Amino acid sequence: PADSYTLGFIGAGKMAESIAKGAVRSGVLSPSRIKTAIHSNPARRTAFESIGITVLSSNDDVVRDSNVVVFSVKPQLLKDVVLKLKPLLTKDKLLVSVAAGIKMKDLQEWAGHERFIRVMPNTAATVGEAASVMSLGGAATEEDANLISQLFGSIGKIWKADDKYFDAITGLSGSGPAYIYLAIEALADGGVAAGLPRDLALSLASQTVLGAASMATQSGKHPGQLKDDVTSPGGTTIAGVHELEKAGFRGILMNAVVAAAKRSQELS
Amino acid sequence: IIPIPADSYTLGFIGAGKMAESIAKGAVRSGVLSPSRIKTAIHSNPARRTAFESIGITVLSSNDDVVRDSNVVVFSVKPQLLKDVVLKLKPLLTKDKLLVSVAAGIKMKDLQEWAGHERFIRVMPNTAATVGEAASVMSLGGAATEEDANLISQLFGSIGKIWKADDKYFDAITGLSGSGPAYIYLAIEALADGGVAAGLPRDLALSLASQTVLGAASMATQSGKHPGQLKDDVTSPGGTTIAGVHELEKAGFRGILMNAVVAAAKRSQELS
Amino acid sequence: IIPIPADSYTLGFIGAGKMAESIAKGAVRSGVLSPSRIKTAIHSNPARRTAFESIGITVLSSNDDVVRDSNVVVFSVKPQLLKDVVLKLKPLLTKDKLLVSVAAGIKMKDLQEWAGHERFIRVMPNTAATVGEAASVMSLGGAATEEDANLISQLFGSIGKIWKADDKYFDAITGLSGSGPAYIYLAIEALADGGVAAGLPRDLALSLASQTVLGAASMATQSGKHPGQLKDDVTSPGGTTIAGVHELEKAGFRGILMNAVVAAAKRSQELS
Amino acid sequence: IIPIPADSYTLGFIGAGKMAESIAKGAVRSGVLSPSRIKTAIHSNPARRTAFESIGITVLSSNDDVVRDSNVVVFSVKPQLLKDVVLKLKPLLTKDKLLVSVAAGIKMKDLQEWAGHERFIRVMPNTAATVGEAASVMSLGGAATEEDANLISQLFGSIGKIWKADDKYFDAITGLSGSGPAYIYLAIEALADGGVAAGLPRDLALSLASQTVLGAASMATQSGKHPGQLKDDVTSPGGTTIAGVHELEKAGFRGILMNAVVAAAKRSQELS
Ligand SMILES: [Cl-]
Ligand SMILES: [Cl-]
Ligand SMILES: [Cl-]
Ligand SMILES: [Cl-]
């Protein structure tokens, strides 16, 4: 039903909006094939209506009218929401959760069936550059997985992974953007420290990060090869790299991923 | 100094390396100009010849002929070779031709002395020109006009973003946008290593690392927000992200990156 | 639970220490209360008696009489003494009287158990109550009404700013706003020492340090800007400010402050 | 050198930037000056024009006319531009006019040489002038009178606190009160980040951070106590505050701040 399927969003937050916008913009879905439900927030109703999507008055009606249901409510609220909708969550409907930290075992127990996909996107869904990972429930089919890959492909990239990896993933793709935000600010501060105007420094920092990551994503090269490509003999770049290595830069980043992943596990 | 005709100028590349090829490809692909308006010269490199010919560009046998036939000349030879190349061409570098250098570390004062005139623009692109995401900066010689600058904006816009700055900033720029990609390549590797340390398969860890960095930078470039606001947006109370961020801070992560920029900039100054 | 009369309620302080004095002075100075509407009890301390009497407040001879005559009772005895004080008063702590605790580290669950009812508000002020610049947070007991909260907001608004938070945040609040002033006192002394190290006279260095900190915090409070944006506003290219900031970052200054808040919060939990 | 009429002097701003605006607003708001006694000149810049006009101040078309019409002339152009601005105005800078520079890093010796006379006061305000909480210091040229100084005390008192110091201290003052606000902006962000690390919501953490810093500085400015005494006042035995302080001390927090001031001061001297 991939071509004509109806998608329903339970939870009308930013992630749902990003998905909806991405799918419409990429032609995966038309707005008439999407529904959401909102209560008592005007800004959010307007967000969906302004892209041509119908906002219904209840979660129940969104589920009834949807082949695929995406849950994006706050993780702490999800169990009760799925609970309440359970009679309507028939096995013919593919359920998807984007809730951070909620395992597949639990999603399946709450819904009462295993036709469930978990996707963990990250913050960059907003600009269509999410790093997402999906895990499949016990009854999710290969076709269900392709549908979801096509849907989340509209907001970034998507990879498959076993549910047991999702803590670590959270420490890397989930939390990693913050590490890069710090890097970007620090690079701009560095520019300014070196005598650059602040606006130029920040512009350059952000676009430098973007370009390097683009090289990494497109080049097919190991990052060490990419580093080798730009480190001319005795040049400026190696001088900067050397400072990084003196400080144990790589290990600091390893430490951040490990700590975030451990925190993820502790938070359950 | 006659204005360069914006819609019909011809472009000549002296130096037929990867940056030239990126600029030429980009400019043709983006419709800035058609291959028939572009010339390069290549001496006994049939591989580089094929690269230019295969996008519809005429390869001439001499630098001299490229310059004669061109309103705008882009010099992308290795920096160490640029002086002699400009001195040899000098009689042909008349003031009606806009000259551009992409050579790293060569200051405008020198370009102008070598050429004998001031109708010269300097651009410093970076390695991401290969994927059309360069961070470039341009500085204007004493006779380069606003219209010259715009012509160059539109040309280097094809390989990434381009900003203007005074030539005196170019050492610091070199340390930030020129060198910065290597800092990010390290960061990507380290993030991947970290993923693996936390139990992730390597291919997934590397895929996620690169795309996480790409996404965050895309947020920074598009959101209109300060990076501190972006960080605040993703750091939930007592959550995983703030745990990771705290580790960064404990270690002085920001100051490490500042140190790298400052060092690279200082090296740039040293190298002249 | 009868509403407390917003314009005419009487306020009683059990515990006549500095915080009580600051609240009383603040409320009188701001016109929230007149001194005739405030009572306290002081057993053998003519110094504290003088402090209250000198601002027009009646000092009674027993806690019991303060409670009987008061609609709102503020407990500000030392935290280790509070349980026994509340237990002794319990027969008088009828549900028509709003109880307030400013005791550090005593949770709402305990306050309510001791008093035998839930018409209780907990506040954690900080030391700057003495100059009307407290950072205070309040948490509501299970029977405290919105009107009770507003009454307390107004009262603690007389000595600084007051925010509302769930009692589960109070360890962390204790580590930040409760303990934070000491971190800033260190910072002020260190800034002054740094001024002197740079050649300034001591009185000027200390004056400048305090006022620099005051001014910056005032900018932070009033500007509506993120602190990163504020920092960007003052860091001129290659200038003195960024030189100083770079030193902070090399040393992991930010992480150190994060560590102090975390440690203090952890200690608060430990002492629970 | 005729005395500047204390109650009726006219004030002229050469440079219409943010600092000039803060001074003008402050002096008007505080009743030191009426807007009709203030002039500025804005050339080719309407946003600045609106800022001054919207507080009742006449914007003239030339620096020359501002100088002619003013008893006191405040120079607040970018430091790099000040020399040429003063040289151009020099014929109009008669010894009956009190000259004032707020330019960072420009020494009195230079101001006096450029103007050709010594009836000059230098002030170094800081960024908190925007909120009336500048830390400012003044130094007197060789012909500035005590009455000139008092006039400038009153004028800069309207945007914060103002002290007097010998010109030789100004590099250190620049590293402390000029640059210091950035150190505190970092501190505020870090304290907020720490609160989030400890489980606080971001908005509360930032609000608490800022107000904690404000309060502590207010305690320092008003209490008449040494910062060490203030620290002792809030460090209860084995309590949360001393646990946080201990973490700061383990990390050498005070030394880090000293380093920042020293580095900023050294940079100031370096920049001349
Ligand atoms: Cl290099
Ligand atoms: Cl998080
Ligand atoms: Cl500065
Ligand atoms: Cl304490």
Author numbering:
A (entry chain G): 7 to 274
B (entry chain H), C (entry chain I), D (entry chain J): 3 to 274
Excerpt from the publication:
The pathway preference appears to depend on nitrogen availability, being the ornithine route preferred under nitrogen-rich conditions. Both routes converge at the generation of P5C, which in the final step is reduced to L-proline by P5C reductase (P5CR, EC 1.5.1.2). Here we report the high-resolution crystal structure of P5CR from M. truncatula (Mt), a model legume plant. The donut-shaped decamer of MtP5CR can be described as a pentamer of symmetric, bean-like dimers that are related to each other by a five-fold NCS axis. The catalytic centers of P5CRs are located between the dinucleotide-binding domain (N-terminal) and the dimerization domain (C-terminal).
In apo structures (unliganded and complexed with L-proline) loop L3 occupies a part of the coenzyme-binding site. Moreover, in these two complexes the imidazole ring of His45 lies in a structural position similar to that of adenine from NAD(P)+. On the contrary, in the crystal structures of unliganded MtP5CR and both holo complexes, chloride anions are present in the catalytic center. Also, highly positive peaks in Fo–Fc electron density maps appear if a water molecule is placed instead of the chloride, suggesting a larger atom. As a consequence, we propose that the Cl− found in the crystal structure reflects the inhibitory role of Cl−.
